[PDB]
Design a protein around this nucleic acid. Sequence first.
DNA 1: CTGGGGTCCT
DNA 2: AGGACCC
Length: 381
Amino acid sequence: SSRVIVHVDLDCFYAQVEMISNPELKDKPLGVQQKYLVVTCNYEARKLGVKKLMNVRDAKEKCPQLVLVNGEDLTRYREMSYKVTELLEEFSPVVERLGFDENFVDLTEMVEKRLQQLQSDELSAVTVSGHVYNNQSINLLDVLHIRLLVGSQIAAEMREAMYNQLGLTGCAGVASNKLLAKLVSGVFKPNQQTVLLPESCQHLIHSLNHIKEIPGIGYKTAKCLEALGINSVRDLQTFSPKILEKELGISVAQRIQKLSFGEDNSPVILSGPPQSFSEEDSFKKCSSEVEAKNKIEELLASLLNRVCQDGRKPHTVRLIIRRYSGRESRQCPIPSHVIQKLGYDVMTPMVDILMKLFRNMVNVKMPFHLTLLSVCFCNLK
DNA sequence: CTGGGGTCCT
DNA sequence: AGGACCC
Ligand SMILES: Nc1ccn([C@H]2C[C@H](O)[C@@H](COP(=O)(O)NP(=O)(O)OP(=O)(O)O)O2)c(=O)n1
Ligand SMILES: [Mg+2]
Ligand SMILES: [Mg+2]
Ligand SMILES: [Mg+2]
């Protein structure tokens, strides 16, 4: 029943890709910018006070010498992401992606086969690779300790393969479920790894200072729980199941309370190929239907390239907008003939479709403006 | 001065 | 179609 899970999280991912592209920025403090957001920075810049998701005014005010590179085109980051995932898939085929830079791998079967090859004189020689969370003592006679140590070794081999084959560094966490692996992977950063033995689970879980630090408890749930007087992990652990179900529904309640105990039975799922391909473009102002139409042509060209490279075809298209004060969208199926002709002028029909979808949302006869235009291709087969 | 992506559930 | 969550 007991699993060995690894979580891998790349060091300052976008920035790391930019530093590999141009080594002139290797030792300069570097931030990757998307409009007015420094979505990440390398660690040199973190030493001078730059933080992830700072806006660029605060970034340059805390660090006026910060070199900034534009990261609004995700192409290189995306390619690198899938190179990491495929490398990990070589170890065990079932790899779950989370964002562009995190991967879960279930090492249970691998650990088992490694232990079955070992002979009883060297079950005593098993050693950890990397950090043991909270300096907990290893008990070599504890089978769970043994298999988590093997997991730490596989994790080290994974990170070394990532470095030697792709030039990327990152952190790994080995634990008995996805939640604990992801929580322990960030304990020693950057480019380090930690293993969590079971006796320390509670310690790990109570090291958190607010519930929103738990993956699965987002902005809305956190705000609700705060309204309920729940602020610590122990608050949520000890809170009434009934009341919590009443305000969050049965699903959210049971899941996040189990999570607050460090319990997580969810399996590592094979991510495989993406379920969708989208591109966004935000701006201060779009009020011309001709302008929006040009934006939409542009997003669509790149999207066509990408979907054609995949080698499977989308069967639904969606357009998304944002009005100046949430988001709104309209989708529709992609006609069969246009679908058959992907990768012929697919562009003009797709444009007409997307523009009709556009006018369904926005009244051209009245005046408007828009702050975000996005196109998504989903329902791939 | 709040990007640009993704997942699954309702 | 929207909402919640993840990075
Ligand atoms: N809200 C977010 C979060 C992440 N990202 C991108 C930029 C990051 O380089 C990348 C990886 O996410 P991340 O791991 O949270 N941050 P990053 O890897 O840069 O730093 P560390 O993981 O080293 O702390 O996703 C984004 O564009 N918008
Ligand atoms: Mg990450
Ligand atoms: Mg990272
Ligand atoms: Mg959270």
